Amino acid sequence: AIPSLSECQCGICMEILVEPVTLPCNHTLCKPCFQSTVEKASLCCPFCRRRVSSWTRYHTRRNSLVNVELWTIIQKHYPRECKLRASG
């Protein structure tokens, strides 16, 4: 099963996990929220305050930041939310 549309949101901006990223601390947030919480914050987890600097480098080096399989579940279970989120 999958958590409802409520928990499918980003735990920061309360919006859908558009292109989510799964941090080493098991947390998740949408790609814009991620890139903000890394390029304008202290490179730490917004949930449990865990630095992911090295992991961030190691994975963006391979462009393996986005979690593809969760994103596929979101696009097959709640596609219209992702599409209405796609414009803005």
Partner: protein, 110 residues
Amino acid sequence: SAKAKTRSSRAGLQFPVGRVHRLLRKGNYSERVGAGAPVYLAAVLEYLTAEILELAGNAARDNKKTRIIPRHLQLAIRNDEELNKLLGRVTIAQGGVLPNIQAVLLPKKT
């Protein structure tokens, strides 16, 4: 930041900023040292030290030791893809090497 506290705090860093300012002045790097450069350089230094110390701490936790020793630093530096390229020529004292055996030398599956 209106805070008239030590410039380290006013920049949010941990590395000293006045000391970096002096080292940039007395070091004959240039005639004038702008007031922004020491803060920037202290931030960069702190960030690099944070990276290396985090990786070394991870390695030391892996080897079940609660105190980083040069071997863990060598492991952390050589296992990362960028910290190795930045320190390609450096030689860590008491660092050992990365454990790896060439594939051709391993015994014949018989």
